[PDB]
Short mmCIF file of C-alpha atoms and ligand atoms in Angstrom, two decimals:
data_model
loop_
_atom_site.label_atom_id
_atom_site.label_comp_id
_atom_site.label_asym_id
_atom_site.label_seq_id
_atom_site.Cartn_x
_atom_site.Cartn_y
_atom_site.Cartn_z
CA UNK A 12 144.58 99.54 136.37
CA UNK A 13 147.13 96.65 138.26
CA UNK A 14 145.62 94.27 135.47
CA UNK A 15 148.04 93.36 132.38
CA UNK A 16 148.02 90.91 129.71
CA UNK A 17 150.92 88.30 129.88
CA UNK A 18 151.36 85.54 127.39
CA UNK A 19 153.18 82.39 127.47
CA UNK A 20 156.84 82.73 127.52
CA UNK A 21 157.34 81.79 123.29
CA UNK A 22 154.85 84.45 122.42
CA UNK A 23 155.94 87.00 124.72
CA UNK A 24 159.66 86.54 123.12
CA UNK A 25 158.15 85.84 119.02
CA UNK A 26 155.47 88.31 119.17
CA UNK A 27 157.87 91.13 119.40
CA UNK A 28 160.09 90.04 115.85
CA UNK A 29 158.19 91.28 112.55
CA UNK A 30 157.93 87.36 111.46
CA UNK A 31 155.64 86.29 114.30
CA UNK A 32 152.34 84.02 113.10
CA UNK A 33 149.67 84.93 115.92
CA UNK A 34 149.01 80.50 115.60
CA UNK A 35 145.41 78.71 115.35
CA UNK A 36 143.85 79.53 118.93
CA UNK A 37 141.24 82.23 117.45
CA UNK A 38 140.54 82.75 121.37
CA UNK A 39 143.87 83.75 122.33
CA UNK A 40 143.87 86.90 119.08
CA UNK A 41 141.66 89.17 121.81
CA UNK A 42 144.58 88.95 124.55
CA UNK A 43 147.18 89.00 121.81
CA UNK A 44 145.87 92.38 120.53
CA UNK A 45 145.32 93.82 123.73
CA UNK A 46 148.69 92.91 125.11
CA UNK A 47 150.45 94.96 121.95
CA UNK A 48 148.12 98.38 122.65
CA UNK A 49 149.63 97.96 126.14
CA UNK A 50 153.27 98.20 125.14
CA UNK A 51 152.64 100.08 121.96
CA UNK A 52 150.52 102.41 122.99
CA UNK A 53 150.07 101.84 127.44
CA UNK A 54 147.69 100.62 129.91
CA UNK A 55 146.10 103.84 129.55
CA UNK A 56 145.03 104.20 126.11
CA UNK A 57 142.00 102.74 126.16
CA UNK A 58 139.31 101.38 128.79
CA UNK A 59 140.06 97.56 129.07
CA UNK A 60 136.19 96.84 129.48
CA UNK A 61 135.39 98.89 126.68
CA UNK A 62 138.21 98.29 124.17
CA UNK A 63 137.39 94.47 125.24
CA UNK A 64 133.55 94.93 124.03
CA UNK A 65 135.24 97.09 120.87
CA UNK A 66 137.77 93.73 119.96
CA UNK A 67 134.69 91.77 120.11
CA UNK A 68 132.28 93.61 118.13
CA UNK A 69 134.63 94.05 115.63
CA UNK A 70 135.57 90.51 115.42
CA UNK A 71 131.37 90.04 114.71
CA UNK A 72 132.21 91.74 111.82
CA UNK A 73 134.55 90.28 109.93
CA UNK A 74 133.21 87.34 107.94
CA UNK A 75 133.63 83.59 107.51
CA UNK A 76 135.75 84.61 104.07
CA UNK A 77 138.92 82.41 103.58
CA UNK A 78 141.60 85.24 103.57
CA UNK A 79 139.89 89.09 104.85
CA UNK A 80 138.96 87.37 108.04
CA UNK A 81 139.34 88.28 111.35
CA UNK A 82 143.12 86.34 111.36
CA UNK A 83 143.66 88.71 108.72
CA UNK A 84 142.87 91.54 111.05
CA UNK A 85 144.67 90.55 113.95
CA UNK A 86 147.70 89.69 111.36
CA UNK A 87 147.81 93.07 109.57
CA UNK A 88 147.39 95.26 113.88
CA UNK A 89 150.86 93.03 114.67
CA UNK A 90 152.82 94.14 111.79
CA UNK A 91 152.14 97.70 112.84
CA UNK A 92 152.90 96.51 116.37
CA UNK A 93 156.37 95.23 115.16
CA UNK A 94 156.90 98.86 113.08
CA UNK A 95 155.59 101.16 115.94
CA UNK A 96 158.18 98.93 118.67
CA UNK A 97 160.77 99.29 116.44
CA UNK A 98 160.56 103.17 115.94
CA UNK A 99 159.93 104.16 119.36
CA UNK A 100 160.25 107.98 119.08
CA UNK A 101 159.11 108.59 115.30
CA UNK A 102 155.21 108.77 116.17
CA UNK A 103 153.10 110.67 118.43
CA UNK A 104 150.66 109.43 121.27
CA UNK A 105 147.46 109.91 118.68
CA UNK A 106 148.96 107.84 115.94
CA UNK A 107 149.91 104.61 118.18
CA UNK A 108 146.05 105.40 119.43
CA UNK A 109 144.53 105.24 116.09
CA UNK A 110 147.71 102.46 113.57
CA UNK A 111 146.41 99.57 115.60
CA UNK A 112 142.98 100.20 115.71
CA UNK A 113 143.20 101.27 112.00
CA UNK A 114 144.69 97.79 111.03
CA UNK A 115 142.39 95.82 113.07
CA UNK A 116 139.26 97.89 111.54
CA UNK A 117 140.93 97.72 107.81
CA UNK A 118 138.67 95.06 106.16
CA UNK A 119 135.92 94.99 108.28
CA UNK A 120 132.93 93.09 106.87
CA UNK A 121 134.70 91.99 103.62
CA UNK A 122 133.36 90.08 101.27
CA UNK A 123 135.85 88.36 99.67
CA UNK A 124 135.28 90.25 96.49
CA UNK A 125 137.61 92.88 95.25
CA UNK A 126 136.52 96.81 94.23
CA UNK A 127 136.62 95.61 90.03
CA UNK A 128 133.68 93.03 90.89
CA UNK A 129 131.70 95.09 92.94
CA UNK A 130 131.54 97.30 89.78
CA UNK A 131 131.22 94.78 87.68
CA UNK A 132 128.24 93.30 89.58
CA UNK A 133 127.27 97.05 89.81
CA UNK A 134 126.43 96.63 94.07
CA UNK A 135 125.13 99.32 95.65
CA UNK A 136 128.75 100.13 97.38
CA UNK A 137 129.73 101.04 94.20
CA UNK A 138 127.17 103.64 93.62
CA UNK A 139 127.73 104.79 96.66
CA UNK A 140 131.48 104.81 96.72
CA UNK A 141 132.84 105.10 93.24
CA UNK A 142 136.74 104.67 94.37
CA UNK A 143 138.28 102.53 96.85
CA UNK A 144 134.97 101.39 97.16
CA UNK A 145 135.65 98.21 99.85
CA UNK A 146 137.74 100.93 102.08
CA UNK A 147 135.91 103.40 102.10
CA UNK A 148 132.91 100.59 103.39
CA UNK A 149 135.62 99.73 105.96
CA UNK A 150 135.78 103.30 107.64
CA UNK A 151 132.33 103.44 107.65
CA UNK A 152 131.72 100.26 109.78
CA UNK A 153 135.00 101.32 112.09
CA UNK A 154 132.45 104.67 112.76
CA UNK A 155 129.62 102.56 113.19
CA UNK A 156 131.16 99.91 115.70
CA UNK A 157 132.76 103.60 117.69
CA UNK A 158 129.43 104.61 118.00
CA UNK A 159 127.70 101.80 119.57
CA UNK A 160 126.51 102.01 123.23
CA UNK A 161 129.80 101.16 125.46
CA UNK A 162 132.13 101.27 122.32
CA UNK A 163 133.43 104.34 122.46
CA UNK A 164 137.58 103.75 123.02
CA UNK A 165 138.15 107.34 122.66
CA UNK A 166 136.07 108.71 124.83
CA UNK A 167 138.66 110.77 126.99
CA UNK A 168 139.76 112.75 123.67
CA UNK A 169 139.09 116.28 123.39
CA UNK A 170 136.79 117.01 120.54
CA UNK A 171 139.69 117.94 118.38
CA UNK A 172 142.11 114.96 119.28
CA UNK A 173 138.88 112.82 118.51
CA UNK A 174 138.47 114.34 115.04
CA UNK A 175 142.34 114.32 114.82
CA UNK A 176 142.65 110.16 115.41
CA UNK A 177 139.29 109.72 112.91
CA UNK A 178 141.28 111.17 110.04
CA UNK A 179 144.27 108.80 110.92
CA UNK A 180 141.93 106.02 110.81
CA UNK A 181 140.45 107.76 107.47
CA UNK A 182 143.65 108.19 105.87
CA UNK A 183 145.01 104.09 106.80
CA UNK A 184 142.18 102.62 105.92
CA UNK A 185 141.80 104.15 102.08
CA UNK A 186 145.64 103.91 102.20
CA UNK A 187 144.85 99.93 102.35
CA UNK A 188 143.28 100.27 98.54
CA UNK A 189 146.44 99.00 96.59
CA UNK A 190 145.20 101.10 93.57
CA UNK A 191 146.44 103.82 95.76
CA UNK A 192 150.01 102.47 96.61
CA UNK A 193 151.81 102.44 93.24
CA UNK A 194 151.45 106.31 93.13
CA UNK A 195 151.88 107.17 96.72
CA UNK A 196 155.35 104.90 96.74
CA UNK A 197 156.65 106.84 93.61
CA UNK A 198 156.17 110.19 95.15
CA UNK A 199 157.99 108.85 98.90
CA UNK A 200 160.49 107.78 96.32
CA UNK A 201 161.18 110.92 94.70
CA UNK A 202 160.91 112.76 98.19
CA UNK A 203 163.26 110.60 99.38
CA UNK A 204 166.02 110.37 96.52
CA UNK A 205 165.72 114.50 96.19
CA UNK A 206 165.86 114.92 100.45
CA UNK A 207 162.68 116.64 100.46
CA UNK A 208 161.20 114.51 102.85
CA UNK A 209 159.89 115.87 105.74
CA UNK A 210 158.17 113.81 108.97
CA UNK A 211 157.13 117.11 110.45
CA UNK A 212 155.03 117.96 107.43
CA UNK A 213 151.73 116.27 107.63
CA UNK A 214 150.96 115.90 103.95
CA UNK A 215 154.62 113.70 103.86
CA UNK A 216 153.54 111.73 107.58
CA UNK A 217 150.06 110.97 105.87
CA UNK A 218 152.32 109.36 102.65
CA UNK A 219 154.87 107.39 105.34
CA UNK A 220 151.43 106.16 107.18
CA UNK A 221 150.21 105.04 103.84
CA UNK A 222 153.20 102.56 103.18
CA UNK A 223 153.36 101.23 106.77
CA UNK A 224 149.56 100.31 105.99
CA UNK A 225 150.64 98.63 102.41
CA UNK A 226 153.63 96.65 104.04
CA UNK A 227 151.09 95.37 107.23
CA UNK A 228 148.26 94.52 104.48
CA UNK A 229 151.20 92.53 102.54
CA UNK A 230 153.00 91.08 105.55
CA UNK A 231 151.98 87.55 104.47
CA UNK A 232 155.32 88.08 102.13
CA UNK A 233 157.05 88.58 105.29
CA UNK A 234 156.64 85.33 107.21
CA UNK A 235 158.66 82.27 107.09
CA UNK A 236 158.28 80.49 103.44
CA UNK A 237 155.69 77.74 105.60
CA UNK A 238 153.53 80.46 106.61
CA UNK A 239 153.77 82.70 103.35
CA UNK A 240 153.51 79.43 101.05
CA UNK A 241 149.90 78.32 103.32
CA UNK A 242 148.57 81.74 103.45
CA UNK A 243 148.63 81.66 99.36
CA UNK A 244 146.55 79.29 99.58
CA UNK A 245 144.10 80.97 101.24
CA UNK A 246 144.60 84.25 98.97
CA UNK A 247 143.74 82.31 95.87
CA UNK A 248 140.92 80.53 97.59
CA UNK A 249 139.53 84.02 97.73
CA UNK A 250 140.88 85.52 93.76
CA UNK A 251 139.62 81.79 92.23
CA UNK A 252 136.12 82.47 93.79
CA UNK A 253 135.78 85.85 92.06
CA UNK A 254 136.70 84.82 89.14
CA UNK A 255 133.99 81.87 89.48
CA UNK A 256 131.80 85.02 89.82
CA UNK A 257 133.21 87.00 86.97
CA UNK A 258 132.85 84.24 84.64
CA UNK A 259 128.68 83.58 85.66
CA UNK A 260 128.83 87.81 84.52
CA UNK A 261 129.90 86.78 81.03
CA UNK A 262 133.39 88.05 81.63
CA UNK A 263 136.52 86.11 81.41
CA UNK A 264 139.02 86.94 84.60
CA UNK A 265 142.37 88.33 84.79
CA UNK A 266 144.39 84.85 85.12
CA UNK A 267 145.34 85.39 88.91
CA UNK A 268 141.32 84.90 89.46
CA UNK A 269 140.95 82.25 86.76
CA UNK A 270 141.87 78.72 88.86
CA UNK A 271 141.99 76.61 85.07
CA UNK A 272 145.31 77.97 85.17
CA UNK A 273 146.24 77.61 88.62
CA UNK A 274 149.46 75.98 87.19
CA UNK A 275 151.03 79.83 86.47
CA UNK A 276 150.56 80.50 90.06
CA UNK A 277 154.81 80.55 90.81
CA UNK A 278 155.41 82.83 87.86
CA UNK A 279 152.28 85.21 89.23
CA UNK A 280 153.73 85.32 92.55
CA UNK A 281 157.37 86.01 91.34
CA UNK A 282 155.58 88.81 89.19
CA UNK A 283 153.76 90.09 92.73
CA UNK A 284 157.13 90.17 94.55
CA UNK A 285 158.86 92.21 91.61
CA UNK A 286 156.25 94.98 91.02
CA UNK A 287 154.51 95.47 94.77
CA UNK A 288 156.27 93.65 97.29
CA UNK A 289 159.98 94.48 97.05
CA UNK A 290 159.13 97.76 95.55
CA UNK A 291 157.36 98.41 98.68
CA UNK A 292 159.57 97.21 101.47
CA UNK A 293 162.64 98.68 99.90
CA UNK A 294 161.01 102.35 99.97
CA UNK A 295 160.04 101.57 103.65
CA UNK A 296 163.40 100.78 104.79
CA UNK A 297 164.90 103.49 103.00
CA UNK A 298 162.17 106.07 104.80
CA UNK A 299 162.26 103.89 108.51
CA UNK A 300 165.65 101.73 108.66
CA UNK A 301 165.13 99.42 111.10
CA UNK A 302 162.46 97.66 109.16
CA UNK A 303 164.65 96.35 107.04
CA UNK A 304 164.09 92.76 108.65
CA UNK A 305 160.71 92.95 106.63
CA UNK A 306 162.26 93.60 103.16
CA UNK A 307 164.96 90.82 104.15
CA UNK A 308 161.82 88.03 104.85
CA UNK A 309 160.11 89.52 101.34
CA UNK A 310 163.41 88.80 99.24
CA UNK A 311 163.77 85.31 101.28
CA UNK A 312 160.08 84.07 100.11
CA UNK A 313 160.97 85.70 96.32
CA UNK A 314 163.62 83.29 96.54
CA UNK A 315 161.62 80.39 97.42
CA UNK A 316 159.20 81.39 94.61
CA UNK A 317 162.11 80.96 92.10
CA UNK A 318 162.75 77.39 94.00
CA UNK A 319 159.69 76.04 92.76
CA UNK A 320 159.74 77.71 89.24
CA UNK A 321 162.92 75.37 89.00
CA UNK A 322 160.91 72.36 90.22
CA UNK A 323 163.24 72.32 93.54
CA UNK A 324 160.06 72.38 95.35
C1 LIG B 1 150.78 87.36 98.41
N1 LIG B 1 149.88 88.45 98.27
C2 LIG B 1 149.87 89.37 99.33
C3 LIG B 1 149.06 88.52 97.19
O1 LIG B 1 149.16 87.63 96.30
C4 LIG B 1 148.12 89.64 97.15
C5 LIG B 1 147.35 90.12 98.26
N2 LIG B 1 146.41 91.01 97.84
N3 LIG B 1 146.60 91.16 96.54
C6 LIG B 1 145.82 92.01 95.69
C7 LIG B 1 147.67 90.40 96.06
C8 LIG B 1 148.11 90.43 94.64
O2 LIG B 1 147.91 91.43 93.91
N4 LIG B 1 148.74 89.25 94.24
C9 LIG B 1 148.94 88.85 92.91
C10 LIG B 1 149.17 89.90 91.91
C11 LIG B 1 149.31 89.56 90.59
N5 LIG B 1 149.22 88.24 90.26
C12 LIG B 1 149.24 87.56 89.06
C13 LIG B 1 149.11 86.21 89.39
C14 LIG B 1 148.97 85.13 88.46
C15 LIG B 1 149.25 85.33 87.10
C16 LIG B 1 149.09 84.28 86.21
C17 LIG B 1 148.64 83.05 86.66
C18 LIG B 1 148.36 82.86 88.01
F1 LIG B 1 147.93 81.64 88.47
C19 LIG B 1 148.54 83.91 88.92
N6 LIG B 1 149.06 86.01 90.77
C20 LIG B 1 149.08 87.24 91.30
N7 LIG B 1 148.92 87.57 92.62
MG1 LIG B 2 141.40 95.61 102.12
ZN1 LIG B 3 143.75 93.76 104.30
#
């Protein structure tokens, strides 16, 4: 009840801008994630005891991968953090409830592997998912962990409410497929261009969720160029291993897997930033102004990118 989260006085200040880096300390994550449901969502939200014993058996499943990792997690839930505190009055009581859990559930128990190899290896989550097959895996372990003994966050929900913040969750976590984005960004852009946009329509809030999820899921693009530039690393550690995997299959990979020609990587970036990345914080803006600090961070790395195409770093 009298018991908040406090963090040292630079985090306090840096966790609140859209750039922040949540730093090495895997310990301190827990706290970190726990101090932004209390200001984005309140002290009340959620049971500390068991939203602590929810963090923590959620962390258990994330795995030892070098990029959808529990950092990952933790990364993607601050980004939202940064949107929600920035739009104060724009969402109601069950969607700051379910965006942060949502973003810390989003890749639970990854594998490292995107949806193409799973079908390629033909694994049974793609027999038993035959679209967004990784996110649809990822809701069903956020159920599972909600349903364990002591886990159960939402407990004080009506039935309805309950039902209500699953399909948030739902909705997030398939909206985390990037398959999906290029389509559901074309429509916000039409809605928005013609003014049909609408936030008290549901079908239109569902889209606007959608892109908040892409632009947390992306938000390595958003950091400062020492923190975008080392998290690549680990994003390639991840695409070079598939495509390890691809090629024992017999198949050649698409070159962003293929690390022979790790040399191309500026140009493949550049090409990232161009179709997905500014595409996708410019419609945000445009739909939620003041993240526009976001798209400002994304053009500031593309710019960097172009630096070392020109061998001036
Ligand atoms: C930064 N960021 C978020 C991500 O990179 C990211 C996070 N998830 N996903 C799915 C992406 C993503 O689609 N990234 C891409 C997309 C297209 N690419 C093409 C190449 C490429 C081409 C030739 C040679 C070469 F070496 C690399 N690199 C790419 N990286
Ligand atoms: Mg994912
Ligand atoms: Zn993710």
């Amino acid at each position: 009840g009298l018991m908040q989260f406090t963090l040292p006085v630079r985090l306090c200040k840096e966790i609140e801008l859209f750039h922040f880096d949540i730093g090495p300390f895997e310990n301190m994550w827990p706290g970190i994630f726990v101090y932004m449901v209390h200001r984005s969502c309140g002290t009340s939200c959620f049971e500390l005891e068991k939203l602590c014993r929810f963090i923590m058996s959620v962390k258990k499943n994330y795995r030892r991968v070098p990029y959808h990792n529990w950092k990952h997690a933790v990364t993607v839930a601050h980004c939202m953090y940064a949107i929600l505190q920035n739009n104060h009055t724009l969402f109601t009581d069950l969607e700051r409830k379910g965006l942060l859990i949502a973003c810390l559930c989003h890749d639970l128990d990854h594998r490292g592997f995107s949806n193409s190899y799973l079908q390629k290896f033909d694994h049974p989550l793609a027999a038993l998912y035959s679209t967004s097959t990784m996110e649809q895996h990822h809701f069903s372990q956020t159920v599972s962990i909600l349903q364990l003994e002591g886990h159960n966050i939402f407990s004080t929900l009506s039935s309805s409410e309950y039902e209500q913040v699953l399909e948030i969750i739902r909705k997030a976590i398939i909206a985390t497929d990037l398959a999906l984005y290029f389509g559901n960004r074309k429509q916000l852009e039409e809605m928005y261009q013609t003014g049909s946009l609408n936030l008290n329509n549901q079908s239109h809030r569902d889209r606007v969720i959608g892109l908040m999820m892409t632009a947390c899921d992306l938000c390595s693009v958003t950091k400062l160029w020492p923190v975008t530039k080392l998290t690549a690393n680990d994003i390639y550690a991840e695409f070079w291993a598939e495509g390890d995997e691809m090629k024992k299959l017999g198949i050649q990979p698409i070159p962003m897997m293929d690390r022979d020609k790790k040399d191309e990587v500026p140009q493949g970036q550049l090409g990232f930033y161009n179709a997905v990345a500014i595409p996708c914080y410019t419609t945000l803006t445009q739909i939620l102004p003041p993240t526009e600090p976001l798209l400002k961070a994304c053009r500031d790395n593309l710019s960097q990118w172009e630096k070392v195409i020109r061998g001036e770093e």
